[PDB]
Write a protein that binds this DNA or RNA. Structure first.
Ligand SMILES: O=c1ccn([C@H]2C[C@H](O)[C@@H](COP(=O)(O)NP(=O)(O)OP(=O)(O)O)O2)c(=O)[nH]1
Ligand SMILES: [Cl-]
Ligand SMILES: [Cl-]
Ligand SMILES: [Cl-]
Ligand SMILES: [Cl-]
Ligand SMILES: [Cl-]
Ligand SMILES: [Cl-]
Ligand SMILES: [Mg+2]
Ligand SMILES: [Mg+2]
Ligand code: NA
Ligand code: NA
Length: 326
DNA sequence: CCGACAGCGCATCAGC
DNA sequence: GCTGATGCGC
DNA sequence: GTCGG
């Protein structure tokens, strides 16, 4: 956190541009600058020094000079004071309320937690659950709880079919000491890129986790993605654990390595890595790495037997999950 | 200058 | 119902 | 907002 003040500022600006301005490219630019600065091993002394880093331009360099000189940014100071911006930024903290819905709600004069709660009938299913657990979803998950959660998920999945493999990915796999949620990658030999020899593969797992009262709510559910809510069981006379977000992704077993690379992240590491692939003439998604033709049309999937294979194609030295937290 | 910015799953909606 | 566009989030 | 060509 050598540059915590600056990265915080950039993140606030990123959030402003996404939530309020609905300028998604400015949002991404700011997050990229924060990320490159976050890993810079020196306490930044000036915007010029930061402008050396890729992704920090002239505008951000000026902002860093203001911030360094004064400890603040007038631009942010004004935004913080704007009722409409504040209201929109707030509402978007509810899972399922994005920039669009937030602005629509404010138009109707629904702009506090209190307002949302009194107008529950104006929320879609996802939004209702996000409101229900608003506080809980703000809390981080200690790694020690993540371990307990992993134990349950892995054991309950084994109980459904001993041929499942469940892997906890996301920030947990990168070694983080706390996570925002739990991400679980699921494979079964019946489901490959070549055929789906068993239906309800994801449904079955979700059902068992609900049966044992681990999964408590559902935000979305399809054949390959589940997004919902879970909770650890508490002991006698113990205060309950907060409800947690859980995401599960069922990937073709033969495409496990691209899948685990994707779900391990970080999001910015993936954006960086995918961008580089493109420069090298490949395209990477959660399923495959394929060459791009002279026309730009993705060719056939290249053979992948490890995460490192993927790195090798794009001429990157291998990076352990712990070193992918960008 | 200016195009491109990673790539995709599920919920919801319009239009037919 | 379908297909396609948009919102939201991974 | 930043960058490569
Ligand atoms: O925009 C995204 C978001 C997520 N992902 C990926 C990478 C990421 O690590 C993974 C899990 O998504 P999360 O939102 O759960 N982020 P993560 O687990 O890395 O951190 P945390 O959950 O602790 O906030 O899916 C993307 O590829 N693009
Ligand atoms: Cl933009
Ligand atoms: Cl500030
Ligand atoms: Cl502004
Ligand atoms: Cl695991
Ligand atoms: Cl693919
Ligand atoms: Cl690691
Ligand atoms: Mg996560
Ligand atoms: Mg997640
Ligand atoms: Na730069
Ligand atoms: Na939200």
């Amino acid at each position: 956190t050598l540059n915590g003040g600056i990265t915080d500022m950039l993140t606030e600006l990123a959030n402003f541009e996404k939530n309020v301005s609905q300028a998604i490219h400015k949002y991404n630019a700011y997050r990229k600058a924060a990320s490159v600065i976050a890993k810079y091993p020196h306490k930044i002394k000036s915007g010029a020094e930061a402008k050396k880093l890729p992704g920090v331009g002239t505008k951000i360099a000026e902002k860093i000079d203001e911030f360094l000189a004064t400890g603040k940014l007038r631009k942010l100071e004004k935004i913080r004071q704007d009722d409409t911006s504040s209201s929109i930024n707030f509402l978007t903290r509810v899972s399922g309320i994005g920039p669009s819905a937030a602005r629509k709600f404010v138009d109707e004069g629904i702009k506090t937690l209190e307002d949302l709660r009194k107008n529950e009938d104006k929320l879609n299913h996802h939004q209702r659950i996000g409101l229900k657990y608003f506080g809980d979803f703000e809390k981080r998950i200690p790694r020690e709880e993540m371990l307990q959660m992993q134990d349950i998920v892995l054991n309950e999945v084994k109980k459904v079919d001993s041929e499942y493999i469940a892997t906890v990915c996301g920030s947990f796999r990168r070694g983080a000491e706390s996570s925002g949620d739990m991400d679980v990658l699921l494979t079964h030999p019946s489901f490959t890129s070549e055929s789906t020899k068993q239906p309800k593969l994801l449904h079955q797992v979700v059902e068992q986790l609900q049966k044992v009262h681990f999964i408590t709510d559902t935000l979305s559910k399809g054949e390959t993605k589940f997004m919902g809510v879970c909770q650890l069981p508490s002991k006698n006379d113990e205060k309950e654990y907060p409800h947690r977000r859980i995401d599960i992704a069922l990937i073709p077993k033969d495409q496990y390595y691209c899948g685990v690379l994707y779900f391990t992240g970080s999001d910015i590491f993936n954006k960086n890595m995918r961008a580089h692939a493109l420069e090298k003439g490949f395209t990477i998604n959660e399923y495959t790495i394929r060459p791009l033709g002279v026309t730009g049309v993705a060719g056939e999937p290249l053979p992948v037997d490890s995460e490192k294979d993927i790195f090798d194609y794009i001429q990157w030295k291998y990076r352990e999950p712990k070193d992918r937290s960008e």
